C-alpha cells in the first residue's frame, strides 16, 4: 500500500533565527508530492538517508549497522515516565515487541517523554551526530503546513545502515519516508516560524521561485537553470592491447643503480597494472603531487619515466620538486 505525502516533512536546518525574510538551504530535505511506504503489518527497512516517521500508541526505535553484538547499536524505549537512550552492542530479535514491565526484545540518556494528535518524527545522521526532530500537530495526511522543532543531539559517531521499529502490546499504522539531497526555500515569519516552503527541482514555477528568492512573481521571462540532459549510461573504450607493462622489472630487481648514475627506463605501448604496487612492500611516505595515489586506473597517458636510486633515510623529503 502506497500513500502520497502532500506537503509535510519540513524541519529547521539549524538553530539560527530569522524574522520575516527568505532563506535558502541545501540539506537532506523531504521532496513534496512523493509516495511514502505506508505499512499495516501486525519486516526491516534499509536506510540511506531519512528515517522520517509519522503515525497516529506506538513506541520504540531500533538503530545500528548489523543489529548484532559485533558492532555498536542504538536503542530507544519510551514509556509514561521518561525516555531511555542506551547505545551498546545489544542483540536484537527479528520481530521484537514490548509488553509494560518486562523486556521481550532480548551511555544512557534520560529526558522528557515524546507524548487525536499526529506524531511526526524526523531523524538525520550526518557529521557523526544524531539529530531528532519532533512536532505533535492535532488533526491520510491532514491538509496543512507546520514545522518540525528540533530536539537534543546524541553524539555516537558510528554509522547507521538499517533500522527497525517496535510494536505495542496492550495494531497500528505508520508512515515511513526517505530523504534526498536537494535545495529548498523556507520563509520565516515575524516570530520565527516556518509557514510555507517552495521546492527548486519541481514544476519550473517552483524553480523560478527558487532562483528569484520570492513567492509572488510577475509576468515575463526568467532564466532559472540550464537544460543539460542528464546522462543515462557510461561509455568507456580502450585499445585491444594487453602486454602487462614491465613494472615487476623496475621494482623486483637485485641492484638498480647509484644516485649519481641513475638509470632511465622507458615503458610504453602496453597497459599499466598499478594494483601490484601495494602487493610488493609497505610504503614509507607515498605522498603524491599532481596525481592521485588512489585513482590511477581511470586516466590514460603516455611515455612514463622511471628512475631508481637510494637515499640514506633522512633525506627522502629532499626527493621532491625543488
Amino acid at each position: 500500500s502506497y500513500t502520497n505525502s502532500f506537503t509535510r516533512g519540513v524541519y529547521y536546518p539549524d538553530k539560527v533565527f530569522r524574522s520575516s525574510v527568505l532563506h535558502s538551504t541545501q540539506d537532506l530535505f523531504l521532496p513534496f508530492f512523493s509516495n511514502v511506504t505506508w505499512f499495516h503489518a501486525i519486516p526491516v527497512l534499509p536506510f540511506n538517508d531519512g528515517v522520517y516517521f509519522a503515525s497516529t500508541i506506538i513506541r520504540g526505535w531500533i538503530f545500528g549497522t548489523t543489529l548484532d553484538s559485533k558492532t555498536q547499536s542504538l536503542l530507544i524505549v519510551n514509556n509514561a515516565t521518561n525516555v531511555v537512550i542506551k547505545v551498546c552492542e545489544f542483540q536484537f530479535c527479528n520481530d521484537p515487541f514490548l509488553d509494560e514491565s518486562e523486556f521481550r526484545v532480548y551511555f544512557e540518556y534520560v529526558s522528557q517523554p515524546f507524548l487525536k494528535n499526529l506524531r511526526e518524527f524526523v531523524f538525520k545522521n550526518i557529521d557523526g551526530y544524531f539529530k531528532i526532530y519532533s512536532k505533535h500537530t492535532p488533526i491520510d495526511l491532514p491538509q496543512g503546513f507546520s514545522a518540525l522543532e528540533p530536539l537534543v543531539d546524541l553524539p555516537i559517531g558510528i554509522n547507521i545502515t538499517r533500522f527497525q521499529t517496535l510494536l505495542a502490546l496492550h495494531a497500528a499504522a505508520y508512515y515511513v519516508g526517505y530523504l534526498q539531497p536537494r535545495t529548498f526555500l523556507l520563509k520565516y515569519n515575524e516570530n520565527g516560524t516556518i509557514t510555507d516552503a517552495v521546492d527548486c527541482a519541481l514544476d519550473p514555477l517552483s524553480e523560478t521561485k527558487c532562483t528569484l528568492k520570492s513567492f509572488t512573481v510577475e509576468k515575463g521571462i526568467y532564466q532559472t537553470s540550464n537544460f543539460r540532459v542528464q546522462p543515462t549510461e557510461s561509455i568507456v573504450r580502450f585499445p585491444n592491447i594487453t602486454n602487462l607493462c614491465p613494472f615487476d622489472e623496475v621494482f623486483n630487481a637485485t641492484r638498480f643503480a647509484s644516485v649519481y648514475a641513475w638509470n632511465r627506463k622507458r615503458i610504453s605501448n602496453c597497459v599499466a597494472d598499478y594494483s601490484v604496487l601495494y602487493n610488493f612492500a609497505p610504503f614509507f611516505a607515498f605522498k603524491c603531487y599532481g596525481v592521485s595515489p588512489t585513482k590511477l586506473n581511470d586516466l590514460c597517458f603516455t611515455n612514463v619515466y622511471a628512475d631508481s636510486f637510494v637515499i640514506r633515510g633522512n633525506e627522502v623529503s629532499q626527493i621532491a620538486p625543488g
Binding site: 603524491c288 599532481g290 592521485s292 595515489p293 585513482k295 581511470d298 586516466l299
Partner: protein
C-alpha cells in the same frame, strides 16, 4: 580561447584533472582554475558592459 590556458595548473582539461587527482590537492587545483576563469569572465563582462 581562455579555456585552453593552463592558468598555472597541471592541465587545461578539467575532467582529466578531476580523474587524476585526489580532492585535497584537487581542491587547490580547482581553486586556481576557478579563480583564473572567473577573472577572465569578469574581464569579459566588464568589456561587454
Amino acid at each position: 580561447k581562455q579555456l585552453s590556458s593552463k592558468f598555472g595548473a597541471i592541465s587545461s582539461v578539467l575532467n582529466d584533472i578531476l580523474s587524476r587527482l585526489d580532492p585535497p590537492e584537487a581542491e587547490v587545483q580547482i581553486d586556481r582554475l576557478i579563480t583564473g576563469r572567473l577573472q577572465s569572465l569578469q574581464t569579459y563582462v566588464t568589456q561587454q558592459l
